[PDB]
Amino acid sequence: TVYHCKVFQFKNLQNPKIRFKLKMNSKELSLKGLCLRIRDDGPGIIIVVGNEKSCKFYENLVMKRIKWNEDFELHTNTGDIKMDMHNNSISKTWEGYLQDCKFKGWFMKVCNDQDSLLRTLGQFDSEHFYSPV
Ligand SMILES: [Y+3]
Ligand SMILES: [Y+3]
């Protein structure tokens, strides 16, 4: 049979609340794929693979329900940080079908450089799904 697939690209995900939601929902839905980002503060990619119903549900989650631009606060050993996200965004970039699915669950990974990200995507035959800048 045939696997439905979607891919999204974000400018930032330092927000722990966003991270939680993406996790929990991937968990509850039986979707497969990954979320990769260049360092804690960099851009990245979400890839999702499953049946049509689940993919559209996730599309809704990510493009409609999540406030990618919502301000949040971080706490450290030297003090507090207020993060304003007015210029963060999410973008849905690819949409289609696969005969083959190389992902084995749904996982996240923070990479050190863009090449580390591209190398990873390539282990799953997916270098092309990303758009560098
Ligand atoms: Y249909
Ligand atoms: Y703001």
Numbering used by the authors: 335 to 467
What does the paper say about this structure?
We therefore determined the crystal structure of yPrp3CTF at 2.7 Å resolution. The protein crystallized with three monomers per asymmetric unit. The electron density allowed modeling of residues 335–467, corresponding to the predicted DUF1115 domain. The structure exhibits a five-stranded mixed β-sheet with two α-helices (α1 and α2) running parallel to the β-strands on one side of the sheet and one (α3) on the other. The first 98 residues of the structure (residues 335–432) form a α/β sandwich with a ferredoxin-like topology and an additional, long β-hairpin (residues 403–421, comprising strands β3a and β3b) inserted between helix α2 and strand β4. The ferredoxin-like fold is further expanded by an extra β-strand (β5), a helix (α3) and a following loop at the C-terminus. In two of the three independent molecules, the β3a/β3b hairpins adopt very similar conformations with their long axes oriented perpendicular to the direction of the strands in the central β-sheet. Residues D405 and D418 at the bases of the hairpins coordinate an Yt3+ ion. To test whether the C-terminal U4/U6 di-snRNA-binding region is conserved in yPrp3, we produced a protein comprising the 177 C-terminal residues of yPrp3 (residue 296–469; yPrp3CTF). yPrp3CTF bound a yU4/U6 duplex containing the complete stem II and a 13-nt yU6 3′-overhang (yU4/U6stem II+13nt) with an apparent dissociation constant (Kd,app) of 0.92 µM as determined by EMSA (first gel and quantification) and with a Kd of 110 nM as determined by isothermal titration calorimetry (ITC).
Except for an N-terminal region, Prp3 is highly conserved from yeast to human and contains a C-terminal domain of unknown function (DUF1115; PFAM ID PF06544). Here, we showed that Prp3 orthologs contain a C-terminal U4/U6 di-snRNA binding region that encompasses a DUF1115 domain and a preceding peptide rich in basic residues. Our crystal structure and targeted mutational analyses demonstrate that the DUF1115 domain acts as a ssRNA-binding domain that specifically recognizes the first 10 nts of the U6 3′-overhang. Our results indicate how Prp3 functionally bridges U4/U6 and U5 in the tri-snRNP by Prp3-RNA interactions on one side and Prp3-protein interactions on the other.
